[PDB]
Design a protein around this ligand. Structure first.
Ligand SMILES: O=C1CCc2ccccc21
Ligand SMILES: O=C1CCc2ccccc21
Ligand SMILES: O=C1CCc2ccccc21
Ligand code: FES
Ligand code: FES
Ligand code: FES
Ligand SMILES: [Fe+3]
Ligand SMILES: [Fe+3]
Ligand SMILES: [Fe+3]
Lengths: 446, 192, 192, 446, 192, 446
């Protein structure tokens, strides 16, 4: 397949070839043009707060060691020995000043440097140039309010610019709330879906909620429960959708601070969020203070998703075109009482974790939609994302980005796939930029 | 067990061994086997309400954890060691049961098939609460659905059972430390 | 079980539960366990003639079904719900045994290896035929052959056993509703 | 591999490259040139007799919904939602007026039309063109005496013409017997063989019976039992073999009406078939009445096989080059007593079902022959099908098709593979026809 | 069993059947079940020293074989039929235990997870040594490590147990004929 | 990938692209340029000593039948029926005068000839040319002191020449000891590593022993036990490394006759080897008699390895780029007492068999090093084998081959990979020779 010419996503992001969820050659191409190029979620300050603390993380199909340095910075390195390529670290988290390979005993520092080689003097003499044998380092590592992302491509935009218009929406909860903590360790489960299936669902799919999650809505008694079985459509003005240049997007459901949490947490959460909102009105204005306590379903392009207020935080780690390893963390506000943080974390896992009853509702939808992309008669078929097209705006006086002023639509699918296609057909960031110079115009046509 | 000598043994595991190597009562082992076999039968036929009514105590904690992989030599990193796949009280189990029984749970059509294999049953009365029964057992749980989906779960269960309404012994605590860190079964949406 | 409340439970499954929750006899559970363990041993060592002679009644029905996947809400489509993977009388079992023992059954060289795991044994005497013993048990059956072929079967078995020649309890009915709709084991050529 | 030029099947069908049973690129090419082009078995009238009745079926690797319309016709559709590609139907059979997607709740009629979209007015307004959003329909659906076949290629010959000379042989049992019923549901088992291995075996392999099935012949006491361990060769005139332009073929074993059925059914069957034969003599002539009660081992190209009289009916559903999902139904004559139909159905499954003891004899033969096609030293080796070559005729006064007037030979292999090669090397039906204009001459050389 | 009639049965297997079909003692079956369940518990928690001290006799032979695949009709080729995956005396088991417990056994970090399922327990006293207890049982052994490595082992165990120090019954022989010829579990580094 | 041009192994064998352990296209290319071209281990005289004795063996991914002929020679044939490609032999060893196919009953002799075809006269008449239907024969089968190797390429050098300079080192144990026997049957286990990972480890990796095998060294009390946890470096003169033109190489650890065997065998072995050495001094000289009782870790290119004295004998049978089926035999000296042979065989399996505690130490090293070769950021990375480079010699007065006069280094990696690259980039033996005309000069640079 010629990725320069092949139209995998049609103009304005209106449709995508179903093969994108199944084609292994395209998956391999994504490793280069999506995962090696873009910002990927690694960890949070709260999981590696002290010097020497480390975790392992996936970046695409690669594994990295993410380590807190003595100077307080974070560096990340391929989890691969520079001698004969053995996996250096076999645990998920810990604290160490270095990592010793279990094959021939080479010792690397937390800073990636090759610090020791067994019997170096007797074996290599002065011939081994250890300065050139440091672990392969992730070129770019940056933080968004404690959330640590990595990128293999030195040419990438800074993380903040990459978030583009989505940053404005995330800031009330990520910054102005006093800050968030990630509660680990994550749940980890393999699903037989393409990573794009849950990514697209979290970035912009409110339409599915009442029907897909009918049983969870009816059984859990959460605040969005009126949607069960499409019994009710959210009123006008119930929310909006947004998307951005580099592909990140989200839905906003006004005021839904208790999110998917069962009735057992609703009163406590609605009091807490409302109280902080009243304080934030004076600091960031009424609209942004309201966004703070509004439910955001967001994907940070390509494969990191979240539900703010619900507190669900996801990495869709790619394995192959029909296999994804789902990492699920909880996010909590730092200044919440500890007992509330604990119950909120359990509730995130209860609803969206390995035995998350909400998450289970999505399994067949995402697995079959992905697997159908391999089927002969469906490869060249068109997946539709045209809901709301012709009603999106850009440059609004209040809400930035390409915005659909309705709670349910496919605005964020269109922006996600526009960026996806621009990357797949480009050889580098400069080409992506050239392919994106009229990004918002393309999205707001008709 | 001396855990300074048996270097691979956790304090918790050593404590649990001790409780069964003491007063062995054959009759209690048999009662425990019946209790667990009947529980597994109700679950296998998806009689989830009957399971709640007959097997589960009002004060239950039903907990399945997933432990982060850490170095055997680790002694400094002291953040949350595990997350809760399940950590349910009775009402939370009831929510899960209603979710299973809801006619708009699309994933349950066509009907799932469950088969449970319960083995290695051990039973011992608590020392300080002569009404508290400790039961340990292992489960293989086979779930089949949709023609060719097959998921097999493996676990050890540390239970406490106590006599409740009508003198019926009911589950007041189940603790499972799930042995596989990354699930390869699509989800853990089964009652271990 | 109220199957109007426990919406996922079939009438048949509810009927079968009832029979074991009644008169529990510990001694009968033990007899049943021995009976099934000895049966499994004979099968595992491929003593198929000994199995017929010692374990199988002349009036046996040996049945394993595969049920078509239908909507949980289905109420109109009323055609054959299942097919018979097995539905054998004694002579038909004998044909299958002779087929296994035939020296020109090429598939049996090199010799197959079977290992059976029988669990969850329950036993209850029939109410109306005090000579009829109901036994329920689950089986994991592992079949290995030809270096790297490994097939694992999982099933619940609803049996009736009755005293026959010499007072020996023998299988007069086995019913299995096989839980996997599409077999991933090359065939179902094993005696569950 | 260049499929225009590559000789995968030699002249006259005399041999085939062993790689055809193992090569995944060729398997992918077959999806296009074999499965998307030819007629594939779907269901029988007897399984979907009433309006609203439906079943799911595979067509190659694709899945379709096959539905009885209100007007009594049958239409088939891809089991894939037109919105975002989720699998519509998750059951194997039922009755419904429509199918609702569990993802976003789109509702399709039994006629494939997009009939409803949740909150269409509020979300899409009048912008969604539902007329263009019907399920992707199987272009061709036709019946052969209740047996329903589908074809994705509008350009295909009518089913009757496609059966070619094989139809004449099937008609006494399929038509003149008063009609057949398919007894469901089918057994379903995955085997590690290429779909062509059992297809070629059923189309024309009588040679294997005495040796492969030695133990089943000896143990079951069926009517063909004298063959056990090659103890006896069938007499001259015991049967014949045939093949046809579009690849279908069969063996005919005269008078073998009880087929593989164990001695417990032999007297009853031999009486029943003989009695109907005596009636049919007067209607269709002695020869055709005899064919009615003769055992036919047939493959309807590409992947539907049967043993008439035994009543075995097979679909070899392709998964990959070394994986096939075997569907096994029973066929019964409508006017048989119901108790006989029930016992006949059980006996079909007893012998050829998931625990079919006859079928088990074939496992290693077909799995290893297929898997060897992947092995380096065997890929370019030649599988032989030359038995009886130079003795076949065409245009016989009594028996139509390319015919070998002997019970055991490889006539039907040659016709099967001649058609296979003509399809693999062609881009469409017109090219197949051009490549087949001397089909019978090629088969009867020397 | 007549092995001339039951053509698939080996002389060894027929001999082993005979020993359990004779004096059935229910109490012995229960003792055996407890013994094996406690042994499996110690192994599952990786209390390997405790296993040696409490479960393993000083004169133990601990043997697991792998049998070469030969024709069922083979009668001429008479070279070594099997190799020993294990064939350990007490000191050799101790070496393996020290290897498990060594802090530089890199493969044991992060800590492995074991779950054993013991079924089909049969017990019979030896005829000529009334202090020798024959115990037969089957094991499914699940080993999980390193996030997504899962290995499942299946075996029948022919044991002899004898009273040792302090009157504690200990393993004096274990024999396993491993049913899979080519291992698909990375290794057989588990105590069956 | 263009294998003519692609530098997979750098000059002098100093490094290799990590992708060589993971790339499936390269694995397929190796089937042709490595496994179909080079000498592969089959069996030993001791396993098929009598006429009619046979075993099955893998040669690459192909399976062969290896049979002792009536004249005392050995011939090997593809385990594939010449009719329709079924696997002929399903057992691992036995004795027979022929092999009958279970599909249609064709009978082949131990000499590969098609000897019988069921009902040939009635079916084929005189038309079947059985002379042309013999099993596909392995072109070359030769012995090195009872050890039987096969090669599919008629153009290969004789086995003795192919062993090149390595033969000199093997001869004291293989020939002058009075001869070896292979004790079967082998252990068989699948590991998730590339075949090259254990091949490279056995050919030249002494560096890993103290660290990788720290726990086995400490626990087993073997003679090399001082190395545990890199507690001690072997003294100068403790051993050497060698490599050869056609890729075979080994390490030599002086005097280590008890090898990895636990203390329970050390005194007995050290007495036995020392006693035979004293006899051999007079026959083959002191140096070669010493080599006899010295521990050799050797790979016979490509995928046969051994530890002499320890008695470990290995075949790394390739399945795919990350899958290898490990066959483990024991080697014993013929004139050892039978009870010693039995205990030695058990000890080989105890340490290096399916439950070999030493072998288990290597699992993660080889599996992760192999699997990392698939990871995107590691494919183009360089595996290093530069230890000792610039200190190797050729043409030494005492020790032949390219030799590093030190116990620990990477000399043998360099020779192994030099030969590997020369084969991968060549179309035949003549091209390999041209690419190898300065083989030792390349290895001894700087
Ligand atoms: O799970 C999801 C994806 C989009 C969404 C919106 C609201 C509530 C939940 C969710
Ligand atoms: O199963 C088969 C394939 C060909 C055949 C001919 C006769 C009887 C059975 C069979
Ligand atoms: O296992 C191996 C590879 C190289 C080696 C050298 C010495 C002892 C053991 C070993
Ligand atoms: S592979 Fe890491 S030290 Fe050699
Ligand atoms: S995928 Fe079917 S309604 Fe959206
Ligand atoms: S495939 Fe071997 S005889 Fe036909
Ligand atoms: Fe959802
Ligand atoms: Fe057959
Ligand atoms: Fe090693």
């Amino acid at each position: 397949m010629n990725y320069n010419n092949k139209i995998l996503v049609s103009e304005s992001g209106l449709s995508q070839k179903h093969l994108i969820h199944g084609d292994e050659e395209l998956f391999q191409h994504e490793l280069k043009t999506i995962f090696a190029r873009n910002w990927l979620f690694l960890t949070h300050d709260s999981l590696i707060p002290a010097p020497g603390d480390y975790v392992t993380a996936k970046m695409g199909i690669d594994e990295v060691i993410v380590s807190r340095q003595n100077d307080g910075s974070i560096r990340a390195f391929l989890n691969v020995c520079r001698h004969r390529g053995k996996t250096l670290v076999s645990v998920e988290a810990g604290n160490a000043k270095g990592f010793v390979c279990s094959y021939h005993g080479w010792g690397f520092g937390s800073n990636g440097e090759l610090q020791s080689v067994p019997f170096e003097k007797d074996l290599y003499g002065e011939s081994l140039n250890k300065k050139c044998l440091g672990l392969k380092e992730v070129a770019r590592v940056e933080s968004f309010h404690g959330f640590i992302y990595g990128c293999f491509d030195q040419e990438a935009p800074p993380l903040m610019d990459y978030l583009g218009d989505a940053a404005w929406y995330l800031e009330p909860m990520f910054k102005h709330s006093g800050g968030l903590e990630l509660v680990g360790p994550p749940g980890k489960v393999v699903i037989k879906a393409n990573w794009k299936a849950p990514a697209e669902n979290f970035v912009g799919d409110a339409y599915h909620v009442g029907w897909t999650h009918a049983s969870s809505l009816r059984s859990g008694e959460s605040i969005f429960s009126s949607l069960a079985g499409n019994a009710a459509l959210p009123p006008e003005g119930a929310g909006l959708q947004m998307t951005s240049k580099y592909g990140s997007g989200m839905g906003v459901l006004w005021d839904g601070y208790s999110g998917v949490h069962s009735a057992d947490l609703v009163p406590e959460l609605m009091a807490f969020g409302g109280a902080k909102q009243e304080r934030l009105n004076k600091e960031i204005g009424d609209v942004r203070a309201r966004i703070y306590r509004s439910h955001l379903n967001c994907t940070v392009f390509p494969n990191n998703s979240m539900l703010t207020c619900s507190g669900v935080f996801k990495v869709w780690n790619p394995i192959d075109a029909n296999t994804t390893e789902v990492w699920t963390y909880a996010i909590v506000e730092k200044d919440m009482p500890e007992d509330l943080k604990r119950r909120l974390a359990d509730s995130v896992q209860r609803t969206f974790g390995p035995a998350g009853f909400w998450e289970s509702d999505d399994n067949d939808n995402m697995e079959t939609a992905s697997q159908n992309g391999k089927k002969y008669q469906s490869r060249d078929s068109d997946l539709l994302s045209n809901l709301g097209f012709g009603e999106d705006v850009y440059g609004d006086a209040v809400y930035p980005g390409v915005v659909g002023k309705s709670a349910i639509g496919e605005t964020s699918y269109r922006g996600f796939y526009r960026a996806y296609q621009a990357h797949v057909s480009s050889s580098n960031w400069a080409e992506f930029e050239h392919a994106s110079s009229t990004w918002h115009t393309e999205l707001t046509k008709t | 067990i001396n855990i300074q000598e048996d270097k691979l043994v956790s304090a918790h595991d050593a404590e649990e061994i001790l409780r069964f190597f003491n007063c062995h009562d054959s009759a209690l082992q048999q009662e425990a086997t019946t209790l667990l076999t009947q529980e597994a039968h109700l679950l296998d036929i998806q009689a989830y309400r009957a399971w709640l009514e007959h097997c589960v105590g009002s004060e239950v904690q039903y907990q399945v954890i997933s432990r982060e992989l850490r170095a055997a030599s680790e002694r400094r990193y002291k953040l949350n060691e595990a997350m809760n796949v399940y950590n349910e009280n009775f009402q939370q189990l009831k929510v899960r049961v209603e979710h299973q029984l809801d006619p708009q749970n699309w994933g349950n059509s066509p009907k799932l098939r469950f088969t449970r294999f319960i083995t290695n049953v051990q039973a011992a009365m608590d020392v300080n609460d002569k009404e508290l029964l400790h039961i340990r057992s292992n489960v293989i749980l086979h779930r089949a659905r949709r023609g060719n989906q097959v998921d097999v779960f493996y676990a050890a269960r540390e239970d406490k059972w106590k006599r409740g309404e009508g003198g019926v012994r009911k589950l007041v605590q189940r603790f499972v430390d799930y042995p596989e860190r990354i699930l390869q079964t699509h989800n853990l949406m089964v009652f271990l």
